[PDB]
């Protein structure tokens, strides 16, 4: 509460909303911010991306260690504050919604991720050339990011993490650590790019994982029929698809790749 009465002082000094929207959960322990930054190995060469800097507790700690930091904030009066409370030489504040703005070239991400964009952000970052990302998420979501094929909570997000990243939950972060207290705990999650990425088709993975409890012949038939295609013209091919004897939530990325390659061969995704 050295940082929490610092928060309260800033919130009141400018008049900023108690919980801005569902719940903006600002990070307020020095321990946690420093462990994020040390897991990241933020050196003076790095160029860092932060999403949602809030009152900039993490931002300022990143700014004194990295060459440059680009930080993306939706609230315009958080920015107006950031400009006044701080005097960074090496920070570019970027107004916008982190899902929609053009990202910088960066080699690292260290961020307290906004919960409502946890999934879109994860999918965007996963298709970026970064060496190391250290991102706090809600723990339920961080568990889905490391879930394994055939596990119940294995999903699009799981598959795409395993296809493209090395993902580690470093350690739980208690709700105590943010104001206001979330109703659930968080996790310090580490992502590095998989040295040998399995590049899958976005639209095919999306198709498959609308209903993941479905078998993959069923999954495929439904998704392509819904596109407008004749259900007659499509059954034979899709019946003979590789790994037809799995449900979609059982697929390893490699098994999704064979399915793509088969559909590519039979003209179905082109
Ligand atoms: N889509 C978004 N793009 C950029 N900044 C955002 C977005 N959504 C929320 N923010 C900002 O995120 C800052 C603080 C957030 N890191 C807190 C999020 C919190 N950890 C949560 O799990 O909900 C605030 O200043 C918000 O304005
Ligand atoms: Zn749930
Ligand atoms: Zn580690
Ligand atoms: Zn029909
Ligand atoms: Zn198989």
Swiss-Prot record:
What is the recorded name of this protein?
Probable ribosomal RNA small subunit methyltransferase A
Q: Which UniProt keywords apply?
A: Cytoplasm, Methyltransferase, RNA-binding, rRNA processing, S-adenosyl-L-methionine, Transferase
Protein family according to the UniProt entry: Belongs to the class I-like SAM-binding methyltransferase superfamily. rRNA adenine N(6)-methyltransferase family. RsmA subfamily.
Q: Cite the HAMAP family for this sequence.
A: 16SrRNA_methyltr_A
Q: What EC number(s) has UniProt assigned to this enzyme?
A: 2.1.1.-
GO MF entries: RNA binding; rRNA (adenine-N6,N6-)-dimethyltransferase activity
First-tier enzyme category under EC: transferase
GO CC annotation terms, alphabetical: cytoplasm
Chain positions recorded as S-adenosyl-L-methionine binding sites? 25, 27, 52, 73, 97, 112
Q: Where in the cell is it found?
A: Cytoplasm
Task: Give the signal peptide, or none.
Answer: none
Protein task = Specifically dimethylates two adjacent adenosines in the loop of a conserved hairpin near the 3'-end of 16S rRNA in the 30S particle. May play a critical role in biogenesis of 30S subunits.
**InterPro entries according to UniProt:** KsgA/Erm, rRNA_Ade_diMease-like_C, rRNA_Ade_Mease_Trfase_CS, rRNA_Ade_methylase_Trfase_N, rRNA_adenine_dimethylase, SAM-dependent_MTases_sf
Q: Which gene encodes it?
A: rsmA
Q: Does the keyword Cytoplasm apply?
A: yes
The species this protein was found in: Pyrococcus horikoshii (strain ATCC 700860 / DSM 12428 / JCM 9974 / NBRC 100139 / OT-3)
Q: Which Pfam families match?
A: RrnaAD
């Amino acid at each position: 509460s050295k940082m929490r009465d610092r928060l309260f002082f800033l919130l009141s000094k400018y008049g900023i909303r108690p919980r801005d929207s569902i719940g903006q959960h600002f990070l307020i322990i020095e321990d946690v911010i420093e462990k994020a930054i040390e897991t990241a190995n933020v050196n003076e060469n790095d160029v860092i991306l932060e999403v949602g800097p809030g009152l900039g507790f993490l931002t300022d700690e990143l700014a004194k260690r990295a060459k440059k930091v680009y930080t993306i904030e939706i609230d315009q009066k958080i920015i107006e504050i950031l400009k006044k409370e701080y005097s960074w030489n090496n920070v570019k504040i970027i107004q916008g919604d982190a899902v929609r703005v053009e990202w910088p070239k960066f080699n690292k991400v260290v961020s307290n991720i906004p919960a409502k964009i946890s999934s879109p952000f994860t999918f965007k970052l996963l298709k970026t050339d970064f060496e190391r990302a250290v991102v706090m998420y809600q723990l339920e979501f961080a568990l889905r990011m490391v879930a394994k094929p055939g596990s119940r909570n294995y999903s699009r997000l799981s598959l795409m993490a395993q296809a493209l990243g090395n993902v580690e939950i470093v350690m739980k972060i208690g709700k105590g650590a943010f104001y206001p207290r979330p109703k659930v705990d968080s996790a310090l999650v580490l992502i590095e790019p998989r040295k040998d990425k399995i590049v899958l088709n976005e639209n095919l993975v999306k198709a498959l994982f609308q209903h993941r409890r479905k078998t993959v012949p069923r999954a495929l038939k439904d998704s392509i029929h819904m596109l407008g295609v004749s259900k007659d013209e499509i059954r034979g091919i899709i019946n003979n698809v590789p790994h037809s004897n799995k449900r979609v939530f059982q697929l390893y990325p490699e098994e999704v790749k064979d399915i793509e390659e088969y559909l590519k061969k039979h003209g179905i995704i082109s």
